[PDB]
Amino acid sequence: MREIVHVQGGQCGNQIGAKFWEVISDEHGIDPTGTYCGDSDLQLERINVFYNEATGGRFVPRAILMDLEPGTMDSVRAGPFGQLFRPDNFVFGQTGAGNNWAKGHYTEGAELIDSVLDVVRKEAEGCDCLQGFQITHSLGGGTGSGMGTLLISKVREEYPDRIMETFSVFPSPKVSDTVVEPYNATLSVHQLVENADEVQVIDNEALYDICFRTLKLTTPTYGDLNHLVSAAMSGVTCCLRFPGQLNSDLRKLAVNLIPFPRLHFFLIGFAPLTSRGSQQYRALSVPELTQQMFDAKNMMCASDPRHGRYLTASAMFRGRMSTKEVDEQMLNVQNKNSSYFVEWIPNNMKSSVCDIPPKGLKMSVTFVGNSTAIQEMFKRVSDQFTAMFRRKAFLHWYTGEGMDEMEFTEAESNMNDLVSEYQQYQ
């Protein structure tokens, strides 16, 4: 009865959500030809959230593939699980957005946005009531930051009631690429503060941090760290997709995690995770998932939760478990670690229980929390932005294609006051 429409923009966005449709497929028994194998009532009764029928029995994903190049959307199509998406929902664009935010937002992305908005209006409005939109993009390039936020602006005015959950990938600046990361990041943040209900902040360095000091991988590749993101994307909408003892919804997360509308930037994480020679050494109980869901490194953003306070927090447990432990462990972290938890909200925790655990595992859990330590991400991009800005850095591309100087100062204002608003509640 409720549908999530996934729109993926950018090279980062298309590759992450290709893993997302791969993990949703085997959570739902979908073969990469559309056929469904394996017999279970629960794996199809709520598949309308992510798949539609095709009068051939083919379950087709709600994917609105987008990038301003015939590049990674060719590799997504040619790879495994690439025949699922409609060839119609593959809007190409041939001019190219070269890591420039104004390219996707103003001067090349404005002539293809009228087609991807037509596609998403054909595919999302043609039902009784859609639950919301799920947008996957990186705010580091030109396509995800530029075209992604342009569609975000147009969707929030056409549907100013639905939930837009955005798994944004902020530029992690300690080790990174492209020299225009602070320009593309800050020029998108001052839009995501208004017209975006939820923004889950993801940094690549934290994905390497899990891949090095939790999974003990040899060579963490882009596919492995896109798999960890798709774990969190599937885990948040678990109750929307399967029955449970304590069901939830994306609006239940929104109303229990947003004290004020501007503060909606969440730290995400997901860990019943373990190394290769330790799953047969490590147990599995609610306290053990709890202690690896607050700790330091399970966060997929490079922001230490100890360097701040939790305004509010939520926990999406999955699988067969006792309802006493899922309540008592959130109490136990609340009263033991009280410094990293605000007081003007008492009892800052939501728990919610799915009954169907993910494939292979016995129980999993995903964190989404509104920690005020997210100020150190906007500060770590602002101090790079003002460094370039004082001597008028790589800018004649941005100004030459139709941006005045006031847009950049307005970018600094709405992101400096975001840090200041997080200061008042820390």
């Binding site: 590799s75 999974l215 040899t218 060579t219 590749t221 596919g223 492995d224 798999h227 019943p272 290769r276």
Partner: protein, 37 residues
């Protein structure tokens, strides 16, 4: 062909490492509350 991903469906990584070891040639005796054979 893109590089292979090393992570299973249950989010446990697939193929293991070997530690860069240290010449495991040792010697073995016995005195285990019985004093040598």
């Amino acid at each position: 062909s893109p590089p292979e991903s090393s992570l299973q469906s249950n989010f446990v990584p697939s193929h293991e490492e070997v530690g860069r070891h240290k010449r495991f040639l040792v010697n073995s005796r016995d005195s285990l509350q019985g004093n040598m054979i």
